[PDB]
Amino acid sequence: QKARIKLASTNIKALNEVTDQIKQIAERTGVRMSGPIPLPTKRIRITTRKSPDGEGSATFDRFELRVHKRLVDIEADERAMRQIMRIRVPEDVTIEIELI
Amino acid sequence: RVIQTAGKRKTAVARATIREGKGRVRINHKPVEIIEPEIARFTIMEPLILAGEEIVSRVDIDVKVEGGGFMGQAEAARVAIARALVEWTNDMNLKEKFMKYDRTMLVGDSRRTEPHKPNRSTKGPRAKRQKSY
Amino acid sequence: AKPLTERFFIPKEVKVMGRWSVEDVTVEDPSLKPYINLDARILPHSHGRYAKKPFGKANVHIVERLINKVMRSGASHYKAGGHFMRREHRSIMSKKMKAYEVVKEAFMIIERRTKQNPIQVLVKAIENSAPREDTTTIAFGGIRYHMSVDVSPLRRLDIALKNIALGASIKCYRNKTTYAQALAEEIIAAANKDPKSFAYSKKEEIERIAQSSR
Amino acid sequence: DEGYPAEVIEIVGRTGVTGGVTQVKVRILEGRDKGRVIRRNVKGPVRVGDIVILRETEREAREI
Amino acid sequence: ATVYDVPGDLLVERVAKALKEVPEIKPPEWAPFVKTGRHKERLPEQEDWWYYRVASVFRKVYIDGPVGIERLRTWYGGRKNRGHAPEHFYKAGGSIIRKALQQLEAAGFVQKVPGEGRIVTPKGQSFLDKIATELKKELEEQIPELKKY
Amino acid sequence: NFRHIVRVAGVDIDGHKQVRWALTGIKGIGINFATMVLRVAGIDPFMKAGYLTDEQVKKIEEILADPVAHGIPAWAVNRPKDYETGKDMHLITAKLVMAWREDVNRLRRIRAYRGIRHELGLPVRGQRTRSNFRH
RNA sequence: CGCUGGGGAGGAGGCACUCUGGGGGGACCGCCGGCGAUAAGCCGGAGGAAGGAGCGGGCGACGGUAGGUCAGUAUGCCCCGAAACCCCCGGGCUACACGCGCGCUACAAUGGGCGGGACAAUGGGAUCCGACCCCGAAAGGGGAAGGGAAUCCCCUAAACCCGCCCUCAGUUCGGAUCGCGGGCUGCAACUCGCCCGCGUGAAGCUGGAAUCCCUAGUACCCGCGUGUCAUCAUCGCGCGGCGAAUACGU
């Protein structure tokens, strides 16, 4: 049995935190791991016009939101699952887990 | 033995493989001798003519190219082929000949596009709409 | 229709386009000798390099220079032959494929007619279309004169090639004649000193005005 | 008409109202005045060592 | 010897000449009164265009199979002169391609994978390689550097 | 054997040309419909007209008379679903103009927007007339 | 499959090459001869994936412009308070003798048409993208796998190459304008919507005086997502493909 964890966030530090934590919890115990795997970064761009009126040359405002993603497979051993679900994850990170 | 190699050009990557053989060269499943057009065929054949006869008569080459137009593909392929020939033959004579002829054979180009700016975004970064006065 | 033995050509030696030699050529004009590149090559294509370096115009093959001067769309905001030649969608702009084919058919006709080497013919044409003199406006005490000034061997070539390509573009505007055939006629005339050459005409006109203002 | 070669030696400076002209020093090497360095205006990109064709050999130019 | 060793236009001509000796391949009722695409204005100027169409479809199925009736519709499209409006790429129609594929199946040259395009059978894969070996034996007289393949 | 001016119904054409382009001179007949007619007639559209026997001329004109009976598809025809007969039919030259006129006149008779626009000489299909349509 | 040697698809199984995204190095006038002043720096030349703030961008000061915005929100004074508030149902902003701005399409061969060969990138997707199969000549219609985004789809782009017809003509250029017909989105398409098929076939044969944009993967040329969007892009913001000419100044 294997378990696959997907992580997304606007901050790289939280991702590195979670990765290090689960990597160490899996290493101190005997479990073959996978990753960390980087997926491409998702960028939401929005180009708008500055002026609230019409007059004036057109100067445009380009905003961007980058979102970094990570993937892991952990092999879902006896205690690994129950000791990994007991993690202290910040609320700026989206973590999901799927059993294959 | 086998030697693998790569080559780049604007939005285009080529992977090449070389070994012992008869003299065949395929670019993406079709022989070089029937590549079209001629302006893209001479580009790929130049190094095989420079190297000579007794060198290419005893190598079989293969190339797989992906991305960016027939000219980009042909140049990436010529680059890969030249690098592989040199790696396989170990001749500074061949190296100096190629570099005299054209140094981009072995030192690829390093030019991509430039982003666009907001007056005529489709046309380009420095083309602008026409003023009136 | 071209035969297959010409549609699928494979060069066996290092010659211009794999067909014509470049060592038997000669130049007797020392002012231009070092600016006419006659290096043994096959494909005369430089992908823009040698352009941002000031004197990079001396490491490019005259054939590629002629090709890039052939990549034309008539003449805009000035007039040649008595007309604006504006095309805007039917022009070979950024089409070296078509320019290459044109120059190829041209050199074919030249070799077929003259019984000589088209590159040697082109060299003699460029010589006989290279102007040695021009005019300019110099100022002293706050007035404008008109003086005659010598021209440099790097600009002579530019004007020669430009005028040849203009004559080609002119002899082909809305007439049954083709671009390649007109280019061949222009080159032959420039080499043989026939007033039918836009290029020789312009040269003699320039030198005439300059000798007058001398 | 067939002119006379002249080898450039020294760039003096740029002249002309627009800046497309160049005053230059040249020595003759073929004709009645081989030697006789002179000053001459020149139009276009030029560099030392170049060699120009002169139609008139006595029309020495102005200084700047 | 194989399809990947010869030019496509020549191969298609030499294959369409033979597609006629096969009787399961016949033009339908509406072939003469029909245009090969929204992106066109005038009708085909040939009387035997159906066979060129079906040969091209055969060979494209060979190469890019499994392939269904949308990728071929795209490859058989082009830009339409819309008048004063500017030009845009448009797709072809989906009766010619379909009837061609059905007739090829009737002749036994292609089979449909259940949910994944459409592919060639072994005899359909034999036909083309035969014709290509012939055309290559011919070209090697003019292109003497085509032998090694 | 060769002629210089052939005379299909009413109209004359140029024998130095191909038939599909020479038939294009009859109002109501294009290049596409000409191609269709010639195909249903059994004639190469690449032969220089003039080599056109009275046989072929008669066949073409009988075709033109009743196309949907010889198998010309009903959709590839000038006037489908005529007002007072159904009867998808085709019209060339002298008949055509009268149909146009009668259509516009019946639009004018019921006092409709399109007929009023036809009268005044203005556009009819929803265009904007402020910057263009200058005489 | 030929002349027996070559050539493709699964699958296991691997990460080598490609790619993705984290960290780190590397280029600094540092070495080499002048000029200047023995300084500051500039210029050759060497070396070097790359050279001289490497290239492209963002952030834009103390203040002025009684510059634009009360019709983006917030806001003072006057004004309407039973109306100038709040809803519905129909019309108009699309009206046309004309003058102007910005663009699209062309006035041919450095091309029009028909048939065959090719090669991308950026981005987006829930009553949403819709492969695959079947009807219809086309526009379009009925089933429906997969997909909550490196997994599936939108997506075999156009200019380009090859072969035949046209051969300097208001034409096989041009493609407006009108007629009959067939359909989609929508509570509702006349006013006033987009798309298709057949017919009709208007000015235009290179443009006075004047005037605009551009220094390298740049301009010219070619097409493509997206923003608006129940439908509708000759527009805006971006993406790639092909690819120069001239000057290193005043």
PDB file of all heavy atoms in Angstrom, chain G residues 180-190:
ATOM      1  N1    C G 180     -33.122  33.581 -51.642  1.00  0.00           N
ATOM      2  C2    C G 180     -32.043  32.710 -51.496  1.00  0.00           C
ATOM      3  N3    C G 180     -30.974  33.064 -50.762  1.00  0.00           N
ATOM      4  C4    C G 180     -30.949  34.258 -50.147  1.00  0.00           C
ATOM      5  C5    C G 180     -32.019  35.130 -50.273  1.00  0.00           C
ATOM      6  C6    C G 180     -33.118  34.762 -51.031  1.00  0.00           C
ATOM      7  O2    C G 180     -32.083  31.605 -52.068  1.00  0.00           O
ATOM      8  C1'   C G 180     -34.264  33.127 -52.452  1.00  0.00           C
ATOM      9  C2'   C G 180     -35.221  32.306 -51.604  1.00  0.00           C
ATOM     10  C3'   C G 180     -36.069  33.418 -51.022  1.00  0.00           C
ATOM     11  C4'   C G 180     -36.276  34.297 -52.239  1.00  0.00           C
ATOM     12  C5'   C G 180     -36.703  35.722 -51.988  1.00  0.00           C
ATOM     13  N4    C G 180     -29.880  34.600 -49.411  1.00  0.00           N
ATOM     14  O2'   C G 180     -35.993  31.496 -52.466  1.00  0.00           O
ATOM     15  O3'   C G 180     -37.261  32.978 -50.400  1.00  0.00           O
ATOM     16  O4'   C G 180     -34.983  34.262 -52.893  1.00  0.00           O
ATOM     17  O5'   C G 180     -35.892  36.348 -51.006  1.00  0.00           O
ATOM     18  OP1   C G 180     -37.478  38.220 -50.560  1.00  0.00           O
ATOM     19  OP2   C G 180     -35.047  38.256 -49.650  1.00  0.00           O
ATOM     20  P     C G 180     -36.021  37.906 -50.737  1.00  0.00           P
ATOM     21  P     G G 181     -37.257  32.705 -48.824  1.00  0.00           P
ATOM     22  OP1   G G 181     -38.595  32.232 -48.414  1.00  0.00           O
ATOM     23  OP2   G G 181     -36.648  33.887 -48.183  1.00  0.00           O
ATOM     24  O5'   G G 181     -36.239  31.496 -48.643  1.00  0.00           O
ATOM     25  C5'   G G 181     -36.540  30.218 -49.172  1.00  0.00           C
ATOM     26  C4'   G G 181     -35.386  29.264 -49.053  1.00  0.00           C
ATOM     27  O4'   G G 181     -34.180  29.900 -49.535  1.00  0.00           O
ATOM     28  C3'   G G 181     -35.005  28.800 -47.668  1.00  0.00           C
ATOM     29  O3'   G G 181     -35.874  27.836 -47.109  1.00  0.00           O
ATOM     30  C2'   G G 181     -33.593  28.306 -47.897  1.00  0.00           C
ATOM     31  O2'   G G 181     -33.586  27.063 -48.568  1.00  0.00           O
ATOM     32  C1'   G G 181     -33.069  29.372 -48.850  1.00  0.00           C
ATOM     33  N9    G G 181     -32.379  30.456 -48.130  1.00  0.00           N
ATOM     34  C8    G G 181     -32.783  31.732 -47.902  1.00  0.00           C
ATOM     35  N7    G G 181     -31.940  32.440 -47.220  1.00  0.00           N
ATOM     36  C5    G G 181     -30.905  31.562 -46.979  1.00  0.00           C
ATOM     37  C6    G G 181     -29.688  31.740 -46.294  1.00  0.00           C
ATOM     38  O6    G G 181     -29.258  32.742 -45.721  1.00  0.00           O
ATOM     39  N1    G G 181     -28.940  30.579 -46.298  1.00  0.00           N
ATOM     40  C2    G G 181     -29.297  29.406 -46.881  1.00  0.00           C
ATOM     41  N2    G G 181     -28.450  28.382 -46.781  1.00  0.00           N
ATOM     42  N3    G G 181     -30.423  29.231 -47.521  1.00  0.00           N
ATOM     43  C4    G G 181     -31.165  30.341 -47.532  1.00  0.00           C
ATOM     44  P     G G 182     -36.172  27.846 -45.528  1.00  0.00           P
ATOM     45  OP1   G G 182     -37.324  26.962 -45.264  1.00  0.00           O
ATOM     46  OP2   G G 182     -36.202  29.235 -45.041  1.00  0.00           O
ATOM     47  O5'   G G 182     -34.892  27.161 -44.893  1.00  0.00           O
ATOM     48  C5'   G G 182     -34.472  25.889 -45.345  1.00  0.00           C
ATOM     49  C4'   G G 182     -33.116  25.507 -44.824  1.00  0.00           C
ATOM     50  O4'   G G 182     -32.119  26.453 -45.285  1.00  0.00           O
ATOM     51  C3'   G G 182     -32.960  25.512 -43.318  1.00  0.00           C
ATOM     52  O3'   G G 182     -33.493  24.358 -42.693  1.00  0.00           O
ATOM     53  C2'   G G 182     -31.459  25.671 -43.147  1.00  0.00           C
ATOM     54  O2'   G G 182     -30.800  24.434 -43.338  1.00  0.00           O
ATOM     55  C1'   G G 182     -31.116  26.607 -44.304  1.00  0.00           C
ATOM     56  N9    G G 182     -31.062  28.025 -43.884  1.00  0.00           N
ATOM     57  C8    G G 182     -31.983  29.017 -44.077  1.00  0.00           C
ATOM     58  N7    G G 182     -31.644  30.168 -43.587  1.00  0.00           N
ATOM     59  C5    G G 182     -30.403  29.936 -43.036  1.00  0.00           C
ATOM     60  C6    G G 182     -29.521  30.802 -42.356  1.00  0.00           C
ATOM     61  O6    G G 182     -29.650  31.997 -42.090  1.00  0.00           O
ATOM     62  N1    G G 182     -28.373  30.149 -41.969  1.00  0.00           N
ATOM     63  C2    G G 182     -28.106  28.835 -42.200  1.00  0.00           C
ATOM     64  N2    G G 182     -26.948  28.356 -41.762  1.00  0.00           N
ATOM     65  N3    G G 182     -28.917  28.018 -42.824  1.00  0.00           N
ATOM     66  C4    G G 182     -30.040  28.628 -43.213  1.00  0.00           C
ATOM     67  P     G G 183     -33.949  24.421 -41.156  1.00  0.00           P
ATOM     68  OP1   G G 183     -34.718  23.187 -40.790  1.00  0.00           O
ATOM     69  OP2   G G 183     -34.567  25.759 -40.897  1.00  0.00           O
ATOM     70  O5'   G G 183     -32.576  24.387 -40.365  1.00  0.00           O
ATOM     71  C5'   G G 183     -32.501  24.790 -39.011  1.00  0.00           C
ATOM     72  C4'   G G 183     -31.090  25.130 -38.648  1.00  0.00           C
ATOM     73  O4'   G G 183     -30.612  26.156 -39.548  1.00  0.00           O
ATOM     74  C3'   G G 183     -30.842  25.722 -37.278  1.00  0.00           C
ATOM     75  O3'   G G 183     -30.861  24.755 -36.230  1.00  0.00           O
ATOM     76  C2'   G G 183     -29.485  26.371 -37.482  1.00  0.00           C
ATOM     77  O2'   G G 183     -28.474  25.381 -37.497  1.00  0.00           O
ATOM     78  C1'   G G 183     -29.640  26.937 -38.895  1.00  0.00           C
ATOM     79  N9    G G 183     -30.084  28.346 -38.886  1.00  0.00           N
ATOM     80  C8    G G 183     -31.235  28.766 -39.448  1.00  0.00           C
ATOM     81  N7    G G 183     -31.336  30.089 -39.265  1.00  0.00           N
ATOM     82  C5    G G 183     -30.264  30.487 -38.599  1.00  0.00           C
ATOM     83  C6    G G 183     -29.831  31.857 -38.108  1.00  0.00           C
ATOM     84  O6    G G 183     -30.498  32.803 -38.302  1.00  0.00           O
ATOM     85  N1    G G 183     -28.611  31.998 -37.404  1.00  0.00           N
ATOM     86  C2    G G 183     -27.800  30.854 -37.169  1.00  0.00           C
ATOM     87  N2    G G 183     -26.576  30.995 -36.464  1.00  0.00           N
ATOM     88  N3    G G 183     -28.211  29.544 -37.638  1.00  0.00           N
ATOM     89  C4    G G 183     -29.485  29.404 -38.369  1.00  0.00           C
ATOM     90  P     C G 184     -31.593  25.060 -34.828  1.00  0.00           P
ATOM     91  OP1   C G 184     -31.717  23.777 -34.115  1.00  0.00           O
ATOM     92  OP2   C G 184     -32.773  25.921 -35.031  1.00  0.00           O
ATOM     93  O5'   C G 184     -30.518  25.858 -33.987  1.00  0.00           O
ATOM     94  C5'   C G 184     -29.389  25.164 -33.502  1.00  0.00           C
ATOM     95  C4'   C G 184     -28.217  26.069 -33.192  1.00  0.00           C
ATOM     96  O4'   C G 184     -28.068  27.082 -34.217  1.00  0.00           O
ATOM     97  C3'   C G 184     -28.303  26.865 -31.907  1.00  0.00           C
ATOM     98  O3'   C G 184     -28.020  26.108 -30.746  1.00  0.00           O
ATOM     99  C2'   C G 184     -27.320  27.996 -32.163  1.00  0.00           C
ATOM    100  O2'   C G 184     -25.983  27.564 -31.988  1.00  0.00           O
ATOM    101  C1'   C G 184     -27.554  28.266 -33.644  1.00  0.00           C
ATOM    102  N1    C G 184     -28.504  29.374 -33.888  1.00  0.00           N
ATOM    103  C2    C G 184     -28.222  30.639 -33.401  1.00  0.00           C
ATOM    104  O2    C G 184     -27.187  30.795 -32.748  1.00  0.00           O
ATOM    105  N3    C G 184     -29.085  31.652 -33.631  1.00  0.00           N
ATOM    106  C4    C G 184     -30.185  31.427 -34.337  1.00  0.00           C
ATOM    107  N4    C G 184     -31.059  32.396 -34.574  1.00  0.00           N
ATOM    108  C5    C G 184     -30.488  30.159 -34.851  1.00  0.00           C
ATOM    109  C6    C G 184     -29.633  29.180 -34.612  1.00  0.00           C
ATOM    110  P     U G 185     -29.000  26.188 -29.478  1.00  0.00           P
ATOM    111  OP1   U G 185     -28.667  25.086 -28.556  1.00  0.00           O
ATOM    112  OP2   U G 185     -30.386  26.321 -29.957  1.00  0.00           O
ATOM    113  O5'   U G 185     -28.604  27.552 -28.763  1.00  0.00           O
ATOM    114  C5'   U G 185     -27.267  27.792 -28.354  1.00  0.00           C
ATOM    115  C4'   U G 185     -27.080  29.187 -27.823  1.00  0.00           C
ATOM    116  O4'   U G 185     -27.011  30.142 -28.912  1.00  0.00           O
ATOM    117  C3'   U G 185     -28.183  29.733 -26.935  1.00  0.00           C
ATOM    118  O3'   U G 185     -28.161  29.213 -25.614  1.00  0.00           O
ATOM    119  C2'   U G 185     -27.938  31.231 -27.016  1.00  0.00           C
ATOM    120  O2'   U G 185     -26.874  31.623 -26.167  1.00  0.00           O
ATOM    121  C1'   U G 185     -27.491  31.393 -28.471  1.00  0.00           C
ATOM    122  N1    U G 185     -28.595  31.842 -29.341  1.00  0.00           N
ATOM    123  C2    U G 185     -28.951  33.162 -29.309  1.00  0.00           C
ATOM    124  O2    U G 185     -28.393  33.974 -28.609  1.00  0.00           O
ATOM    125  N3    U G 185     -29.985  33.502 -30.124  1.00  0.00           N
ATOM    126  C4    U G 185     -30.691  32.680 -30.956  1.00  0.00           C
ATOM    127  O4    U G 185     -31.606  33.114 -31.643  1.00  0.00           O
ATOM    128  C5    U G 185     -30.267  31.340 -30.926  1.00  0.00           C
ATOM    129  C6    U G 185     -29.261  30.981 -30.145  1.00  0.00           C
ATOM    130  P     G G 186     -29.517  28.732 -24.892  1.00  0.00           P
ATOM    131  OP1   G G 186     -29.170  28.274 -23.532  1.00  0.00           O
ATOM    132  OP2   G G 186     -30.294  27.855 -25.793  1.00  0.00           O
ATOM    133  O5'   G G 186     -30.357  30.064 -24.716  1.00  0.00           O
ATOM    134  C5'   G G 186     -29.885  31.097 -23.877  1.00  0.00           C
ATOM    135  C4'   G G 186     -30.582  32.398 -24.134  1.00  0.00           C
ATOM    136  O4'   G G 186     -30.430  32.776 -25.519  1.00  0.00           O
ATOM    137  C3'   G G 186     -32.081  32.422 -23.916  1.00  0.00           C
ATOM    138  O3'   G G 186     -32.453  32.525 -22.555  1.00  0.00           O
ATOM    139  C2'   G G 186     -32.507  33.615 -24.750  1.00  0.00           C
ATOM    140  O2'   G G 186     -32.279  34.828 -24.064  1.00  0.00           O
ATOM    141  C1'   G G 186     -31.548  33.523 -25.931  1.00  0.00           C
ATOM    142  N9    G G 186     -32.174  32.867 -27.084  1.00  0.00           N
ATOM    143  C8    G G 186     -32.002  31.596 -27.526  1.00  0.00           C
ATOM    144  N7    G G 186     -32.710  31.310 -28.571  1.00  0.00           N
ATOM    145  C5    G G 186     -33.403  32.472 -28.829  1.00  0.00           C
ATOM    146  C6    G G 186     -34.335  32.775 -29.843  1.00  0.00           C
ATOM    147  O6    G G 186     -34.757  32.057 -30.755  1.00  0.00           O
ATOM    148  N1    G G 186     -34.786  34.076 -29.720  1.00  0.00           N
ATOM    149  C2    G G 186     -34.399  34.954 -28.763  1.00  0.00           C
ATOM    150  N2    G G 186     -34.958  36.150 -28.836  1.00  0.00           N
ATOM    151  N3    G G 186     -33.536  34.691 -27.816  1.00  0.00           N
ATOM    152  C4    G G 186     -33.084  33.436 -27.915  1.00  0.00           C
ATOM    153  P     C G 187     -33.653  31.636 -21.972  1.00  0.00           P
ATOM    154  OP1   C G 187     -33.606  31.753 -20.503  1.00  0.00           O
ATOM    155  OP2   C G 187     -33.624  30.301 -22.599  1.00  0.00           O
ATOM    156  O5'   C G 187     -34.976  32.352 -22.488  1.00  0.00           O
ATOM    157  C5'   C G 187     -36.226  31.691 -22.379  1.00  0.00           C
ATOM    158  C4'   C G 187     -37.404  32.635 -22.483  1.00  0.00           C
ATOM    159  O4'   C G 187     -37.328  33.642 -21.445  1.00  0.00           O
ATOM    160  C3'   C G 187     -37.532  33.442 -23.766  1.00  0.00           C
ATOM    161  O3'   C G 187     -38.100  32.708 -24.833  1.00  0.00           O
ATOM    162  C2'   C G 187     -38.398  34.616 -23.330  1.00  0.00           C
ATOM    163  O2'   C G 187     -39.766  34.250 -23.313  1.00  0.00           O
ATOM    164  C1'   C G 187     -37.937  34.833 -21.892  1.00  0.00           C
ATOM    165  N1    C G 187     -36.994  35.960 -21.730  1.00  0.00           N
ATOM    166  C2    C G 187     -37.437  37.253 -21.982  1.00  0.00           C
ATOM    167  O2    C G 187     -38.598  37.415 -22.375  1.00  0.00           O
ATOM    168  N3    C G 187     -36.589  38.287 -21.816  1.00  0.00           N
ATOM    169  C4    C G 187     -35.353  38.053 -21.393  1.00  0.00           C
ATOM    170  N4    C G 187     -34.532  39.077 -21.226  1.00  0.00           N
ATOM    171  C5    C G 187     -34.882  36.755 -21.113  1.00  0.00           C
ATOM    172  C6    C G 187     -35.730  35.747 -21.287  1.00  0.00           C
ATOM    173  P     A G 188     -37.359  32.653 -26.248  1.00  0.00           P
ATOM    174  OP1   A G 188     -38.010  31.644 -27.100  1.00  0.00           O
ATOM    175  OP2   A G 188     -35.922  32.556 -25.952  1.00  0.00           O
ATOM    176  O5'   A G 188     -37.664  34.065 -26.904  1.00  0.00           O
ATOM    177  C5'   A G 188     -38.998  34.495 -27.103  1.00  0.00           C
ATOM    178  C4'   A G 188     -39.069  35.976 -27.360  1.00  0.00           C
ATOM    179  O4'   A G 188     -38.577  36.689 -26.203  1.00  0.00           O
ATOM    180  C3'   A G 188     -38.220  36.475 -28.512  1.00  0.00           C
ATOM    181  O3'   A G 188     -38.889  36.354 -29.753  1.00  0.00           O
ATOM    182  C2'   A G 188     -37.907  37.912 -28.126  1.00  0.00           C
ATOM    183  O2'   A G 188     -38.945  38.782 -28.538  1.00  0.00           O
ATOM    184  C1'   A G 188     -37.878  37.840 -26.599  1.00  0.00           C
ATOM    185  N9    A G 188     -36.515  37.772 -26.045  1.00  0.00           N
ATOM    186  C8    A G 188     -35.835  36.658 -25.672  1.00  0.00           C
ATOM    187  N7    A G 188     -34.648  36.869 -25.199  1.00  0.00           N
ATOM    188  C5    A G 188     -34.536  38.238 -25.255  1.00  0.00           C
ATOM    189  C6    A G 188     -33.499  39.091 -24.889  1.00  0.00           C
ATOM    190  N6    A G 188     -32.359  38.655 -24.386  1.00  0.00           N
ATOM    191  N1    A G 188     -33.680  40.405 -25.065  1.00  0.00           N
ATOM    192  C2    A G 188     -34.842  40.810 -25.571  1.00  0.00           C
ATOM    193  N3    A G 188     -35.898  40.110 -25.953  1.00  0.00           N
ATOM    194  C4    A G 188     -35.675  38.810 -25.767  1.00  0.00           C
ATOM    195  P     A G 189     -38.110  35.860 -31.063  1.00  0.00           P
ATOM    196  OP1   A G 189     -39.088  35.384 -32.058  1.00  0.00           O
ATOM    197  OP2   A G 189     -36.984  34.989 -30.680  1.00  0.00           O
ATOM    198  O5'   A G 189     -37.474  37.186 -31.645  1.00  0.00           O
ATOM    199  C5'   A G 189     -36.883  37.155 -32.925  1.00  0.00           C
ATOM    200  C4'   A G 189     -35.971  38.318 -33.188  1.00  0.00           C
ATOM    201  O4'   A G 189     -34.889  38.338 -32.218  1.00  0.00           O
ATOM    202  C3'   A G 189     -35.298  38.276 -34.562  1.00  0.00           C
ATOM    203  O3'   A G 189     -35.180  39.587 -35.103  1.00  0.00           O
ATOM    204  C2'   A G 189     -33.921  37.739 -34.240  1.00  0.00           C
ATOM    205  O2'   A G 189     -32.938  38.038 -35.200  1.00  0.00           O
ATOM    206  C1'   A G 189     -33.662  38.414 -32.908  1.00  0.00           C
ATOM    207  N9    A G 189     -32.573  37.839 -32.119  1.00  0.00           N
ATOM    208  C8    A G 189     -32.361  36.582 -31.637  1.00  0.00           C
ATOM    209  N7    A G 189     -31.240  36.455 -30.983  1.00  0.00           N
ATOM    210  C5    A G 189     -30.670  37.715 -31.043  1.00  0.00           C
ATOM    211  C6    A G 189     -29.477  38.255 -30.548  1.00  0.00           C
ATOM    212  N6    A G 189     -28.574  37.585 -29.856  1.00  0.00           N
ATOM    213  N1    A G 189     -29.227  39.543 -30.792  1.00  0.00           N
ATOM    214  C2    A G 189     -30.122  40.232 -31.489  1.00  0.00           C
ATOM    215  N3    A G 189     -31.272  39.849 -32.005  1.00  0.00           N
ATOM    216  C4    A G 189     -31.486  38.565 -31.741  1.00  0.00           C
ATOM    217  P     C G 190     -35.019  39.798 -36.685  1.00  0.00           P
ATOM    218  OP1   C G 190     -35.022  38.487 -37.358  1.00  0.00           O
ATOM    219  OP2   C G 190     -33.869  40.703 -36.922  1.00  0.00           O
ATOM    220  O5'   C G 190     -36.356  40.551 -37.086  1.00  0.00           O
ATOM    221  C5'   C G 190     -36.667  40.792 -38.441  1.00  0.00           C
ATOM    222  C4'   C G 190     -37.175  42.194 -38.661  1.00  0.00           C
ATOM    223  O4'   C G 190     -38.407  42.373 -37.930  1.00  0.00           O
ATOM    224  C3'   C G 190     -36.286  43.332 -38.176  1.00  0.00           C
ATOM    225  O3'   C G 190     -35.253  43.677 -39.073  1.00  0.00           O
ATOM    226  C2'   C G 190     -37.276  44.458 -37.938  1.00  0.00           C
ATOM    227  O2'   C G 190     -37.592  45.128 -39.146  1.00  0.00           O
ATOM    228  C1'   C G 190     -38.504  43.697 -37.462  1.00  0.00           C
ATOM    229  N1    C G 190     -38.656  43.652 -35.997  1.00  0.00           N
ATOM    230  C2    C G 190     -39.364  44.652 -35.354  1.00  0.00           C
ATOM    231  O2    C G 190     -39.808  45.588 -36.024  1.00  0.00           O
ATOM    232  N3    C G 190     -39.542  44.584 -34.026  1.00  0.00           N
ATOM    233  C4    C G 190     -39.050  43.554 -33.357  1.00  0.00           C
ATOM    234  N4    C G 190     -39.238  43.527 -32.051  1.00  0.00           N
ATOM    235  C5    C G 190     -38.334  42.512 -33.989  1.00  0.00           C
ATOM    236  C6    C G 190     -38.173  42.600 -35.299  1.00  0.00           C
TER     237        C G 190
END
